[PDB]
Design a protein around this nucleic acid. Structure first.
Ligand SMILES: [Zn+2]
Ligand SMILES: [Zn+2]
Ligand SMILES: [Zn+2]
Lengths: 64, 45, 50, 50, 1123
RNA sequence: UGCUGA
DNA sequence: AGGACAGCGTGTCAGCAATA
């Protein structure tokens, strides 16, 4: 639904790299370069953003 | 002051005993109760 | 923390207590604290020529 | 749209910058809490069209 | 086409796109073509097929007084749903969003205009209102048709929905394609139970299933009798009637016995048992009394008049026509064509009897077709319209039989007197599923016709519109031969997608490329084209010997006898027309040419089907490259390569579109299904439909019963490309987890799995359930005063602060067992009833819908409360991978006791490595490496089956990917022990795999009973789980308890924990019934013998007493010897 | 009666 | 007395909806 606040395996905080991730992808950067530029070194964190599906943007479209 | 939001009009209707359950400004027949400010306690675990 | 649309509201009070990362991970103070033994590499023979 | 229990969970996993060495553990059943063992924060936000 | 723009490898840059949430301009179009067979069938059934159905509808003439009245139905029209009468306001339309909030049927109005005449000169056209027929969602008689995704969101709909279902009481019944034998094609069968039909019948016969314009079906069997004679069995109204052939052939055609005989001996004009048996059919039963067409019709009329229930003023010759029109060969209008078709079915029984032809297996898809939702709907509509006519005129004939002259004053008051019928009958077929009909509709099944469509996941829902049920009766059979997965269902049914228990082999699913035909065409210029091509009409001059000629058939109608050296060219020419869309050949005609040799192969001949219910599938037509469509029977006589370099010059007539065309939609979502053993991949298909996922986007609107939701789903980093064609990320199903294949705990053995505790506390696989309960309070009362208004009498100590003055919990409040839940108020008396919450689980009220009565006039009697129950992964919950590797959660291993890797990481799933050796799921070991490589490189690899060969391996590919990231080829990273702190001697295999969470939780399957509802009849624990619920001991278990010789344990358990009673006996006379208690000392006295001191107590069960009572209920006596 | 679990 | 035949039979294990 919404970005998890902390990576499940480690506990690293990834809930503040969602908008930065989206901004570096709009600038032309690959998902690899983008996840690198955010400080997500170990692949447990990289999967937390790489495979996130933002469904809070589709629920926030039906009437109040 | 029990408020109910319409199904697609979203007008606040206050209903009581002995009166029908239609909505004003439209005629729909489904109305959702409203959330008031009441205190509830949740644990962060 | 969340996302809102016009007319939507959040209102709450949070209480923070002390605790150790043993009874819940939220209280844990480190991303990771692991360690690794220092590797050792030895060339038994002089490698050369591509 | 975010539930109450899910909001409480998400709020538990947010790290606070208070140093835990100036505080103390809440005694069992100390629901109220005092300056000695608790910190309180408030989130009150409403979304409106500009 | 329609399979172009299919993704070549999956992508991940669609999520993280600046336009993710913007509703799109038009709907998806690949998801739409899934329920297309359910909607395009109904579209015909309700507009173009309804006119045809009413057109048959013989005018219902009957006698009133001394008068004969005729009633015909000129048109019938079904209208979109709408507010009942005008008694409502501001919007005539009615959208399916409601009737899900309220619990009601989306039903449109069916009205016809009857025309009643008295001898045909006095007539008036009245327009009666027949009733209400349910409507499909996007079906052209629905209000959500032609709405873009953005306008489909302002009505509360899915923005990606394809309806193809009905809403009967807000439950979304999903009537599914049943399997029928075939239509308008004679199937020669060898069934040994046929010789019991009479004295001299054999186990040979050709069956035909006839359907006329999708409104009528009938089954006729031509049986061979040992004498060489053929009989005809027809069924009218569920009764089987046997007519010798010859009676039928002479009636249908005014031809001599010579041209007729010359017809049934067309290809075997040298055989002499046949020539002799044909003559016996014509003479033995027809020169016995009837030799002109009329006398045959007259004799046939008299015998059958009683059971065809014909009009009394009908000549017998007219009653015969009624039988031929309504019972034999419904499909053909002519009687001359009906003769030629009965003659080819006989010419075929003679070949099956003489072993010149092979029996057609009824269980091969070659000789099978599907029953769509529109065929069932119209075939029920037509029958109910006929029944309505019959009932209105029953009322007519029964009321007065009185001087209709002035009775034309109440004619409408008469028709309305029985027009009160057609509504409830229709809802039974949809709400219950079983069929109550005078004729079973030529179906063979009367239950399970419609089923609940449940949105547990979007992979459970999408599989209800691609299911095909062999039949509900085959679930009860000793022999298992309709469960064989024959090689003729290649490309039409998925090998893997079948339920894996009692429904195995019986409930199949269509492949992704397969499709049902639903269009109806003219097919009138085809018989005139076939003659230009080289066919010679049935009338004559074949130009050869009738044995070197193929019998041409086109939809039940025998065009006739294409020469044997012109049949191949004709079939190829017809196939080229359909491919290039020339002539008017439908793009989907099946040109079949079953060759003839001297061997007992299937009966020869050129068939040409174009009917609206066959399955077809696309294949790249080589030599034209034009994407032909082939059918189940046309596919058996053609070579279809799969991969290129498998195409040859003479061989390989066609080629398949994609290599994975054979697999279903769900079986195309399993990653690397090629490297797992098959019982596993079939298991994956049944476990992906029980997964807790994201079921839909519109909460607050559904008011279902249960609805499982996963909080934070992710999209697989390794997934087949088809996962991206039908965007399945609009609805995700699981989460990516770092799995290590290690034996470390002692709690992960024998199918159990370990979950890190910090991963579980950081939100791994959290979930919820939505229990919506519809409280309609018209219960607790009957038609009296309104005892029903939600409400609180002021100050009730019972609801002091749990309700909010309308007897409904607060939105957001937490509910626990014993909490107030609602409060009605009988308005007249003025008394409230708190109605407490009794579930032994904690939830939070999240919404409450107040519903009206459909005329906007309801009075606070019905409500719908939705509770939210948090269901996070506990111990005892079932998890699964995408490869059939299910397993409960046995431990939550502390995060500091987990084996950490040299990179600092720590797995969050521990999977014992012993599930691989016996289950051979090598696809999990490849998914781990593919997902680790994906997470490392930010990529997204595809797990499409059949993309990686022996030369290009998957392990080579993904090990190179890993070694290019600094990890090691074989996917093993070396861990440390989180308990001893030492580097384990073995390097562990770790990776990223996609886990689903199953819907079966220990919280829903746990029971403890001590004492509780004792069943009154037997004084035993009640059972179930909702009450205390006991555990039946059983006859199998007492045997084991006495093997151990523990008699007292078996005594204590049964007697003391079950029915232990303390009855009294007349010790002298040994009767349980005899002892008696005085009305209030209360000393027992025997009724049979007046002795009061004989009575003494004996320990006995209640079922023992119940059995003594039951035996007395028959005059039997149980005399028991007391000691 | 349609489902589901071993 | 050679049959013809009509006639009974069973069928592991617990849950839920829902409705007769
Ligand atoms: Zn991490
Ligand atoms: Zn309104
Ligand atoms: Zn006695």
């Amino acid at each position: 639904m919404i970005i998890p606040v902390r990576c499940f395996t480690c506990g690293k905080i990834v809930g503040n790299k969602w908008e930065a991730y989206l901004g570096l992808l709009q600038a032309e950067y690959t998902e690899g370069d983008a996840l690198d530029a955010l400080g997500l070194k170990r692949y447990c964190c990289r999967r937390m953003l790489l495979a996130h599906v933002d469904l809070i943007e589709k629920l926030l479209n039906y009437a109040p | 002051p029990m408020i109910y939001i319409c199904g697609e009009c979203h007008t606040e209707n206050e209903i009581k005993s002995r009166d029908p359950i239609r909505c004003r400004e439209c005629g729909y027949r489904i109305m959702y109760k409203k959330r008031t400010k009441r205190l509830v306690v949740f644990d962060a675990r | 923390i969340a996302q809102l649309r016009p007319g939507q509201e959040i209102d709450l009070l949070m209480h923070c207590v002390k605790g150790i990362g043993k009874d819940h991970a939220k209280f844990s103070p480190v991303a990771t604290a692991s360690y690794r033994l220092l590797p050792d590499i030895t060339l038994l023979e002089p490698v050369e020529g591509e | 749209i975010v539930q109450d229990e899910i909001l409480a969970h998400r709020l538990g996993l947010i790290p606070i910058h208070a140093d835990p060495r100036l505080f103390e553990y809440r005694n069992q059943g100390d629901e109220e809490g005092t300056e000695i063992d608790t910190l309180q924060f408030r989130l009150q936000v409403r979304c409106t069209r500009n | 086409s329609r399979w172009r723009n299919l993704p070549s490898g999956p992508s991940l840059k669609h999520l993280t796109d600046p336009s993710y949430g913007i509703p799109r301009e038009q709907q998806k179009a690949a998801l739409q073509e899934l329920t297309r067979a359910h909607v395009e069938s109904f579209n015909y059934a309700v507009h173009e097929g309804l006119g045809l159905a009413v057109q048959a509808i013989p005018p219902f003439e009957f006698a009133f007084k001394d008068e004969r009245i005729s009633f015909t139905i000129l048109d019938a029209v079904i209208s979109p749903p709408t507010v009942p009468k005008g008694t409502i306001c501001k919007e005539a339309n009615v959208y399916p969003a409601e009737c899900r909030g309220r619990r009601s049927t989306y039903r449109g109005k069916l009205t016809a205009d009857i025309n009643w005449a008295v001898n045909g000169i006095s007539k008036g056209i009245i327009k009666q209102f027949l009733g209400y027929v349910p409507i499909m969602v996007k079906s052209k008689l629905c209000n959500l048709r032609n709405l873009p995704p953005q306008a489909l969101i302002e009505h509360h709909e899915e923005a990606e929905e394809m309806g193809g279902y009905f809403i009967i009481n807000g439950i979304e019944k999903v009537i599914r394609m049943l399997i029928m034998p075939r239509r308008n094609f004679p199937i020669a069968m060898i069934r040994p139970k046929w010789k019991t039909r009479g004295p001299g019948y054999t186990q040979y016969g050709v069956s035909m299933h006839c359907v006329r314009e999708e409104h009528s079906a009938v089954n006729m069997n031509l049986h061979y009798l040992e004498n060489g004679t053929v009989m005809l069995n027809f069924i009218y109204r569920k009764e089987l009637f046997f007519l010798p052939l010859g009676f039928a052939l002479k009636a249908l055609v005014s031809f001599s016995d010579y041209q007729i005989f010359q017809e049934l001996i067309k290809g075997k004009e040298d055989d002499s048992f046949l020539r002799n048996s044909v003559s016996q059919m014509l003479r033995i039963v027809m020169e016995e009394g009837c030799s002109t067409q009329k006398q045959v019709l007259n004799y046939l009329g008299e015998c059958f008049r009683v059971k065809l229930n014909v009009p009394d003023w009908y000549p017998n010759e007219q009653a015969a026509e009624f039988l031929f029109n309504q019972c034999i060969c419904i499909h053909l209008k002519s009687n001359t064509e009906k003769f030629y078709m009965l003659c080819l079915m006989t010419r075929k029984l003679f070949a099956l009897a003489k072993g010149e032809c092979m029996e057609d297996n009824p269980d091969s898809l070659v000789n099978q077709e599907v029953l769509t939702p529109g065929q069932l709907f119209l075939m029920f509509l037509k029958e109910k319209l006929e029944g309505w006519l019959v009932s209105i005129k029953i009322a007519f004939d029964k009321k007065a039989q009185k001087t209709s002259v002035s009775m034309n004053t109440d004619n409408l008051m008469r028709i309305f007197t029985m027009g009160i019928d057609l509504t409830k009958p229709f809802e039974y077929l949809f709400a219950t599923g079983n069929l109550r009909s005078k004729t079973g509709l030529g179906l063979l099944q009367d239950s399970g016709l419609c089923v609940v469509a449940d949105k547990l996941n979007f992979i459970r829902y999408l599989s209800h519109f691609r299911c095909v049920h062999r039949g509900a009766d085959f679930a009860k059979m000793r022999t298992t031969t309709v469960r064989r997965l024959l090689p003729e269902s290649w490309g039409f049914l998925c090998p893997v997608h079948t339920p894996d228990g009692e429904p195995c082999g019986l409930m199949n699913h269509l492949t992704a490329v397969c499709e049902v035909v639903t269009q109806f065409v003219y097919t009138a210029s085809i018989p005139a084209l076939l003659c230009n091509l080289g066919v010679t009409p049935i009338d004559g001059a074949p130009h050869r010997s009738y044995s070197e000629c193929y019998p041409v058939l086109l939809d039940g109608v025998m065009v006739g006898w294409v020469d044997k050296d012109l049949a191949p060219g004709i079939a190829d020419s017809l196939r080229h027309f359909k491919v290039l869309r020339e002539k008017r050949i439908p793009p989907w005609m099946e040109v079949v040419l079953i060759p003839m040799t001297g061997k007992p192969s299937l009966y020869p001949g050129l068939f040409l089907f174009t009917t609206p219910c066959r399955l077809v599938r696309p294949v790249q037509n080589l030599a034209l490259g034009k994407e032909e469509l082939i059918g189940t029977m046309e596919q058996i006589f053609m070579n279809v390569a799969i991969f290129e370099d498998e195409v040859f010059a003479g061989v390989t007539t066609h080629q398949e579109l994609f290599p994975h065309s054979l697999l279903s939609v769900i079986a195309n979502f399993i990653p690397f299904s090629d490297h797992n053993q098959s019982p596993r991949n079939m298991y994956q298909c049944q476990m992906g439909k029980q997964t807790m996922g994201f079921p839909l986007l519109t909460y607050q609107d559904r008011s279902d019963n249960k609805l499982y939701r996963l909080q934070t789903p992710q999209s697989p980093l390794v997934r087949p490309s088809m996962y991206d064609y039908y965007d399945m990320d609009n609805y995700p199903i699981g989460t990516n987890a770092i799995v290590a294949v290690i034996s470390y705990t002692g709690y992960d053995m024998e199918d159990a799995m370990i979950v890190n505790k910090a991963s579980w506390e950081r939100g791994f696989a959290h979930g919820s359930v939505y229990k919506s309960e519809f409280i309609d309070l018209s219960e607790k009362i009957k038609q009296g005063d309104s005892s029903l208004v939600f409400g609180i009498k002021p100050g009730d100590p019972r609801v002091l602060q749990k309700l909010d003055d309308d007897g409904l919990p607060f939105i957001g409040a937490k509910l626990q067992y014993g909490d107030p839940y609602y409060s009605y108020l009988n308005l007249n008396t003025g008394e409230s009833f708190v109605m407490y919450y009794k579930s032994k689980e904690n939830c939070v009220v999240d919404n409450i819908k107040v519903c009206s009565n459909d005329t906007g006039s309801g009075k606070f009697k019905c409500v719908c409360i939705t509770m939210r129950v948090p269901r996070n992964p506990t111990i005892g919950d079932k998890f699964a991978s995408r490869h059939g590797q299910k397993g409960i959660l046995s431990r939550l291993w502390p995060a500091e006791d987990m084996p950490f890797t040299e990179s600092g990481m720590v797995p969050d799933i521990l999977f014992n490595p012993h599930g691989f050796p016996s289950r051979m799921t090598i696809g999990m070991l490849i998914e781990s490496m593919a997902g680790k490589s994906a997470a490392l490189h930010g990529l997204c690899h595809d797990a499409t089956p059949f993309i990686f060969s022996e030369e290009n391996s998957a392990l080579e590919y993904f090990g190179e990917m890993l070694k290019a990231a600094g990890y090691n080829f074989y996917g093993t990273e070396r861990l440390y022990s989180g308990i001893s702190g030492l580097e384990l001697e073995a390097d562990i295999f770790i990776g990223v795999v996609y886990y689903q969470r199953l819907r079966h939780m220990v919280s829903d399957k746990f029971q403890v009973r001590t004492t509780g509802a004792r069943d009154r009849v037997t004084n035993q624990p009640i059972g179930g789980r909702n009450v205390q619920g006991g555990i039946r001991f059983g006859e199998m278990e007492r045997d084991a308890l006495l093997a151990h010789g523990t008699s007292f344990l078996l005594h204590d358990r049964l007697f003391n924990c079950s029915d232990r009673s303390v009855a009294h006996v007349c010790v002298k006379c040994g009767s349980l019934l005899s002892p008696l208690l005085e009305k209030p000392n209360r000393k027992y006295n025997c009724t049979l013998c007046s002795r009061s001191d004989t009575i003494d107590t004996v320990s006995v069960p209640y079922v023992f007493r119940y059995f003594v009572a039951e035996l007395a209920a028959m005059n039997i006596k149980v005399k028991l010897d007391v000691v």
